[PDB]
């Protein structure tokens, strides 16, 4: 809806500070997005606004399309996706900055 889809990218490796989350994330990150939806930077006041919009649209769209295939995400998945998509949305912002 005026949103672009960026190129696929490496999913960042997150350390959570405890072995359970660390292992859960490593084993499940293939289920999470590896490209983000974004609007052009020129439609946002600052980077924080670009990023928050990017996180929420990406996760919402990812939840919808994977649900049709039978995916089931729990709260742990959503909070991990919020953390990894946040970093990937920051990267997308930086990729759009490199266009200059």
């Amino acid at each position, epitope marked *: 809806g005026g949103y672009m889809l960026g190129s696929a990218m490496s999913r960042p490796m997150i350390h959570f500070g405890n072995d*359970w989350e660390d292992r859960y994330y490593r084993e499940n990150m293939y289920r999470y997005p590896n490209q983000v939806y974004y609007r052009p930077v020129d439609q946002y006041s600052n980077q924080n606004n670009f990023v928050h919009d990017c996180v929420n649209i990406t996760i919402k769209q990812h939840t919808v399309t994977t649900t049709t295939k039978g995916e089931n995400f729990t709260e742990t998945d959503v909070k991990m996706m919020e953390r990894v998509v946040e970093q990937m949305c920051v990267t997308q912002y930086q990729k759009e900055s490199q266009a200059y």
Partner: antibody
Amino acid sequence: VKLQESGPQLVRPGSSVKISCKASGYSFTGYFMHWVRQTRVKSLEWIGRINPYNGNTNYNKIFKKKATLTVDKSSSTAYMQLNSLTSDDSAVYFCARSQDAWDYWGQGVTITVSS
Amino acid sequence: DIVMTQSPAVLATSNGERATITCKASMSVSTSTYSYMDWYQQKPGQPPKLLIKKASNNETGVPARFSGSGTKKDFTLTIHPVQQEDVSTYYCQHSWQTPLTFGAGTVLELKR
């Protein structure tokens, strides 16, 4: 980690109430917040949850339009407002922090709906 | 909603002996690597206290005489040896989806 709820309330049938849940000691937006009530029969009845990160909510739809969940990120406080209360809504209401498990709870708020 | 059938409704157990609480879910709440079952303990006048999450992981500070086990549809909370402070009502709860529904509860009481 602490979840601190507002005090007990006596409300007349048909009116509204707003209960607060002040969180401290952790990243407020990093966890969902659930609201649940424990009835006279000791059964747990789910009201809904909110994601403080983006404000998204999921409600016990059997309730209809009885409850509204909000957060104030500035004060890291969660609010549950209940509308059009009846005597059957008398119960202890809890907020609880969650990531696939309710690991920290508020102390409970006893609401009595009575004339 | 997922229905969890918890039994027994009531349980009397001698000091130092073994108590076992069972939860059967109406559908699977596991994958081959993780099971989505929690156990709580509630004492009078207090909110429930989380003892075990993801079927088998003790919360910090919970003594090791509590243990969670099972998979798929069948889950168990075991207490051994049971101590006097263990008298209370215990609940299972799945975390597979919302709502995170509860079993009806088990009132555990000590003999003496």
